[PDB]
Write an enzyme that holds these catalytic residues in place. Structure first.
Site, short mmCIF file in Angstrom:
data_model
loop_
_atom_site.label_atom_id
_atom_site.label_comp_id
_atom_site.label_asym_id
_atom_site.label_seq_id
_atom_site.Cartn_x
_atom_site.Cartn_y
_atom_site.Cartn_z
CE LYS A 1 2.57 -64.60 46.36
NZ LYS A 1 2.33 -63.16 46.63
CE1 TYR B 1 14.26 -61.64 52.13
CE2 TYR B 1 12.64 -62.03 53.83
CZ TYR B 1 13.91 -61.71 53.47
OH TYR B 1 14.86 -61.45 54.43
N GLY C 1 3.99 -59.49 45.66
CA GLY C 1 4.84 -58.50 46.29
C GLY C 1 4.60 -58.40 47.79
N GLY D 1 -0.27 -64.73 43.34
CA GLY D 1 -0.56 -63.50 44.03
C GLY D 1 -2.03 -63.31 44.06
N1 LIG Z 1 10.00 -59.84 55.37
C1 LIG Z 1 10.73 -59.28 54.40
N2 LIG Z 1 12.02 -58.90 54.68
C2 LIG Z 1 12.79 -58.31 53.68
N3 LIG Z 1 12.44 -58.03 52.42
C3 LIG Z 1 11.14 -58.42 52.14
C4 LIG Z 1 10.25 -59.03 53.05
N4 LIG Z 1 9.03 -59.28 52.44
C5 LIG Z 1 9.19 -58.81 51.18
N5 LIG Z 1 10.42 -58.26 50.94
C6 LIG Z 1 10.93 -57.62 49.69
O1 LIG Z 1 9.90 -57.56 48.77
C7 LIG Z 1 10.22 -58.18 47.52
C8 LIG Z 1 9.15 -59.13 47.05
O2 LIG Z 1 8.89 -60.27 47.88
P1 LIG Z 1 8.45 -61.54 47.03
O3 LIG Z 1 8.27 -62.70 47.98
O4 LIG Z 1 9.55 -61.86 46.06
O5 LIG Z 1 7.09 -61.25 46.24
P2 LIG Z 1 5.77 -62.08 45.95
O6 LIG Z 1 4.69 -61.78 46.95
O7 LIG Z 1 5.32 -61.67 44.58
O8 LIG Z 1 6.11 -63.56 45.97
C9 LIG Z 1 11.61 -58.77 47.61
O9 LIG Z 1 12.39 -58.37 46.47
C10 LIG Z 1 12.10 -58.34 49.03
O10 LIG Z 1 13.30 -57.53 49.06
#
Ligand SMILES: Nc1ncnc2c1ncn2[C@@H]1O[C@H](COP(=O)(O)OP(=O)(O)O)[C@@H](O)[C@H]1O
Ligand SMILES: [Mg+2]
Length: 309
Positions: free
Chosen positions: A99, A101, A96, A237
């Site tokens: 990574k 995104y 969360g 994670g």
């Molecule tokens: N830089 C960012 N800009 C916009 N939304 C973000 C950003 N970083 C995280 N998010 C939000 O947080 C959520 C999780 O990011 P994600 O990469 O999917 O998680 P993880 O760390 O488990 O891979 C997404 O659903 C997104 O909307």
């Protein structure tokens, strides 16, 4: 050698309900984390090649956009790929933190991540090539590494196992390697991929591309090849299952500082042997939560990224 950046995201639903106060600040390339208990305790300071401030929204003038991210790191890493060298980018952080995104991103308002962009860029530079002596080939592979069994994130089966061919080196047996001939086509594979992903964001997603460059030598008339191995990765994670993850990330840590006998120490690490080190530049984006409730994990990440140097 080795390139590290950190990126703090905007508050998420949880943090928002928790009124979670922001404890991360950035000043160029210096993310400073403040301890919750001691609001004073002066923000702890770290310094990386890049410290992206994405705590707000694509609005705020001062917001690190997916383009910025890709243009600074991806763009160059793709360039080196053309030069003929292996490349690997890594997303690492609490689940969360951001990574996925960052690597994949979204679609609307073009929030494409590094992978989608890098791809579009690779094909864009190829199609605009106006020298008939240069012909290209792009092979893609996409996968998931769980409990250290490789899952073909773009296919059925036949669980797969990663071997160590005599000379050639590491490889996932029976893993699909599809030659694509256009961005769109490579874009479907992506969508299908992130689509198959169900699981539980607990496994490593490795998007590999084997870029081949064939040059027709006017003189001598000898076509020489030049192969590049791009590997874009979405690590776990960080925060038995944990055993493989911990061992993986760890092994990886004692490498970046090193690259700037730990290896078979784990599948993930045993697989990118041609990308982790030996040579070829690597890069590492570190997703960071801006929430106080994550202080320990957020900090731990930072330290992990600080050690990568
Ligand atoms: N830089 C960012 N800009 C916009 N939304 C973000 C950003 N970083 C995280 N998010 C939000 O947080 C959520 C999780 O990011 P994600 O990469 O999917 O998680 P993880 O760390 O488990 O891979 C997404 O659903 C997104 O909307
Ligand atoms: Mg996910």
């Amino acid at each position: 050698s080795v390139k590290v950046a950190v990126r703090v995201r905007p508050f998420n639903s949880r943090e928002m309900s928790r009124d979670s106060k922001c404890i991360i600040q950035m000043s160029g390339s210096t993310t400073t984390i403040v301890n919750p208990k001691q609001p004073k305790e002066t923000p702890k300071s770290f310094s990386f090649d890049y410290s992206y401030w994405s705590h707000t929204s694509p609005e705020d003038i001062n917001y690190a956009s997916q383009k910025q991210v890709y243009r600074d790191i991806g763009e160059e890493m793709l360039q080196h790929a053309f030069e003929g060298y292996n490349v690997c980018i890594f997303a690492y952080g609490q689940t969360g933190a951001g990574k996925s995104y960052t690597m994949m991103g979204k679609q609307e308002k073009d929030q494409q991540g590094i992978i989608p962009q890098l791809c579009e860029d690779l094909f864009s530079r190829i199609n605009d090539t106006t020298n008939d002596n240069m012909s290209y080939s792009v092979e893609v592979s996409y996968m998931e590494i769980y409990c250290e069994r490789v899952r073909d994130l773009l296919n059925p089966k036949n669980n797969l196992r990663v071997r160590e061919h005599p000379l050639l080196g590491p490889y996932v047996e029976d893993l699909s390697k599809l030659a694509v001939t256009s961005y769109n086509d490579i874009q479907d594979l992506m969508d299908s991929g992130n689509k198959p992903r169900e699981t539980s964001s607990r496994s490593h997603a490795v998007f590999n591309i084997i870029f081949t460059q064939k040059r027709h030598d006017a003189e001598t008339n000898i076509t020489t090849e030049k192969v590049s191995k791009i590997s874009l990765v979405d690590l776990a994670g960080s925060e038995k299952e944990g055993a493989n993850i911990n061992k993986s990330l760890t092994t990886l840590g004692k490498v970046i500082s090193a690259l700037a006998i730990p290896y078979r120490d784990s599948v993930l690490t045993w697989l990118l042997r041609e990308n982790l080190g030996g040579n070829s530049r690597t890069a590492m984006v570190a997703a960071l939560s801006p929430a106080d409730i994550n202080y320990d994990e957020t900090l731990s990440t930072l330290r992990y990224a600080d050690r990568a140097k």
